[model samples]
Target: AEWIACLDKRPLERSSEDVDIIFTRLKGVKAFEKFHPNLLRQICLCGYYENLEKGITLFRQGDIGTNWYAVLAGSLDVKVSETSSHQDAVTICTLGIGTAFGESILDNTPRHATIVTRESSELLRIEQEDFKALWEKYRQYMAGLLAPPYGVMETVPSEKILRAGKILRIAILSRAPHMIRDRKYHLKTYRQCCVGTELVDWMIQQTSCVHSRTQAVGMWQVLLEDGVLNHVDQERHFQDKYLFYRFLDDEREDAPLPTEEEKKECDEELQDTMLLLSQMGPDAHMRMILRKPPGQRTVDDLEIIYDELLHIKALSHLSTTVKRELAGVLIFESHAKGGTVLFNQGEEGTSWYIILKGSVNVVIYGKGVVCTLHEGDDFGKLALVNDAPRAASIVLREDNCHFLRVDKEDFNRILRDVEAN
Candidate 1:
């Protein structure tokens, strides 16, 4: 089944005239068509346009709200109520094309401020009832509009809070690298932006490198230990840091040997990791590290390590180099599973595999079962360079096997000299 569908009276393709009309009438709607074409069209029909010369009042404060206005062309200045007797009205901001204002129609609230056009303008206005109906039909759009406007979009209804927590965790994790790169700059930015200093300190404390030493709390501990996250202000930093540590502790307990339920969870998590890796592109900074060489490991061995790292980096964006470096230093054990195929003969080469334990049977079409490879043996070199079929098929011979695998992109681009022929 198709993953997404759009309902529209108009055909998917349009002529130049249609395009011009749509742009002229709905210029301020942004590109909702990318996400939902049917909904965009529904909104486009909500209201007609009002052509106004420069310096016209589109709406004034305390005017009975009847419609919302989205500027299709030209500019507007917004002024808020005066703060003091002597103070002049505050200029909140200026709006231009693609900017929507006077959304009071959706809530029956009084106009927040007065809006004056800076130039002759065209606007798409929506009646209060139509706007409310659109919001009712598309609650996701309403939530997006009502959101704080800076964080990631909350798409999943049930998981909104969970997703928000994850985003906050990532924001905290991202602070560490920035701190390592520049302490004073991050510190100043955080303070000026009102990002509590304590959170920055906590980020430094939670650094894998810093947490490994001193075990102290606060920015001072991070400076003395990790020295990488140098942001000022240390409020709530320890709380965030502790949360990460507790999560890690839970992960360690969950490790060792996963049950069937745990295995399923791990598989789901792996899929998410795979999706992220793909979205980040082949050239993204994220990397995979292998403790044992792919030549010496089996599929099961690789799976275990992959699962572990997926859990660790789920909330962090470690560069590919760092990932590989960290994995290179870890120890790995091999196990065997009979059905595992280390590499296929006809697939494109994009990565190399290492057999850390057990044995695999290599089968070629013309040659039949050509050979049996043991620990330290590897294949799939051809696919790394180009899209090609595997020269042979490899199947595990034993029940418990382990291996280490690295993508061709990481090996070639990152360790370029090592893979060069």
Candidate 2:
């Protein structure tokens, strides 16, 4: 109303053109498809044609909403940034023909994303006054019009599934030095698969659209629904836990068969894992999840691991609440050979290790073996606590030595929690 009043103060004679070319283009736009032909022409007259050079920014993410824009030709990049500056902006997607933006002006919100011309482009722009006037007149029909133009068009399910499959195969699975494939969780290995937590981590690092682990999990669930991927064990849901998932396109070749004795050992281990779970106190959810298969433990179901840590004399001094928290963060490592150096003196300590089985020799440079740490003993904690290099090298003294390791970040957080109380 104020803008219309500003224009009403003009005293000079006014003239306008039919702009038949622009009117035809506006009529063809997906958002304007439902507009009455008369109304469409009226809205079309309010918009002026614009020619933008390649790399020009139409608007930034936080700028005041001013114009309603529609692509006439070429394309534009939709970029988002963690910081206020565009230096670190990431292009989440692109806007092409018939797409519209700057609709946030209706509610007076700042621009949600930066729009930059991907190439020399023709566009149609209606200033805030005309844009709002048109919106106020056709408010009921705006829902259908506003949906697609706000960002990119909605992707077809089949296309999205194919894209999801291609991304998994090319970007993640086939990449060199791959971290998303064939992960070892607990006692078993899942081939041609990825951990849910690791997949979400990779998405956050590699994809512009994924801003959080939870959001990535939701996208993975959509891929699962579209048949692009599935839980490795055929479980139905997606989660940002340490559960395993596999791409549907991966070949399902036969694995090497376990011989009679090896099969018996596998059965024995499965039985042992179940027996250990039985001792962890009643957690119906954990037990129900374990019922699926042997050695299917995940960080989500840490009750059994927590029970084992309760027996460690060094950690037994901690309260149940503290020990339970450790179960969520501790990683299990088993070394089959003796004389394996875990870390060298003067090396930065990345983890704190608790001896779950066997023992280790703490050796100093020139001084051979200075001390031996037995089962239930913890080491490397001081190094992480003080952010210093290892005091001495730790080497396994016996075959099949097992340790519960905690990364530096998790260790410091737990330490801070204990100190706070």
Candidate 3:
């Protein structure tokens, strides 16, 4: 069975240049490796080709097949059906060099669409059984190839929408630093510097609404306040510029803003999430809904939200000013056995500390063990303010150690900026 041919005879009318081009295209895609060696050999041996004229049917809909086709040259217009006299068959897609058609053969399904050469064309055809076997061998590779391109669709079902919304909310909450800072001039500058944040917040809400409406209607369509998505994108671009100005502090003005790859990745992930949502019809949506009891939360729900926010905040487009402010306020509390060293003298201080509760023994090399610092007492101030080595080592004196450590730079910047007003 392993010795079976992977592809059928190709038309001889095609040139070596054509075959080379097709093979070159396949080389870029690892999925072609799934084809049996013998089948590929057979395809090379059976070299055949047809200059299919315009309007000619390559394959009719409802045809049973285990065979697939690859375009060597020219293009083919794929349509939803054959019998529908309506000339307006939804053009599912257009095929180009190395593009494969009749993927349904891999699954042993009847032809899902009709293929017509839009112009004089050359194509390589392969049998269905072989295609199915190849697919089975390289399911993951094939899935990636068939996956939709990035950022095409944005909305999905309610659950994903809600999760994405939550992530955006968390990101916003995490980044808020000063309530009042700078004078009116400075406040205006800060607002200008952080302009896009509100737009991102709005986009998240719109996406959530789109998903909610999709779930209710049982179909994916552009649904939301009119012009909302475009507005969000525009606002985000403006914010990107503001952030660039804040970080560079250039008064020269009109410098080209940098595009963050993280923003693109977030868009791609969001698009994939939407595709998954659209593919999953009412049944799958209903299953998700039923999986959760009334008022009960699932880990998946939380995870979805977490992931969305993580993607958004991780983007370079976000303002670093906002990020620094947010990082300053983030605190973690830990309980450890007494004698646990929190910081060692001479260690580079990346963070500062505030004692929210409990007590710790402060030790200096020359000073030996200093007094115990308790709640409201803060240490590591010098280290936080500058990129200097720690002044001393500190350790927990009790079983419960609770403190908030903020990065020194972030802490001081926010504090100074807030206090300057």
lDDT scores for all predictions?
0.44, 0.60, 0.44
**Per-residue CA lDDT of candidate 3, range 256-310, in tens?**
3213453444444554554443454342232233234323534443333223223
lDDT of 2 by residue, 1-421 (tens): 2222222332132123344544655677744666777667666566666778999998887788788877767667666555768796655335556556667776676776678887888786778887777777766665444532332111123674555454444455333226545767779977878778887787666535344564455556666655567788877667778788776656465533334554454434433322332333232232233333324556545665565566555464477877776766667677888778888877886786767566666555653443345455567655555665665667776677877677878866876787776
**Residue-level lDDT tens digits of model 1 in 299-356:** 4334434444554411123454445443543434344456576556665456555454
Judging by TM-score, tell me the better candidate of 2 and 3: 2
Flag clash pairs in model 2. Answer: none
Clashes of each: 56, 0, 15
Preferred candidate (lDDT higher): 2 or 3: 2
Score candidate 3 by TM-score against the native: 0.30
Compare the candidates by lDDT and give the number of the best one.
Answer: 2
| TM-score to true structure, per model | 0.31, 0.33, 0.30
Q: How should the candidates be ordered by TM-score, best one leading? A: 2, 1, 3
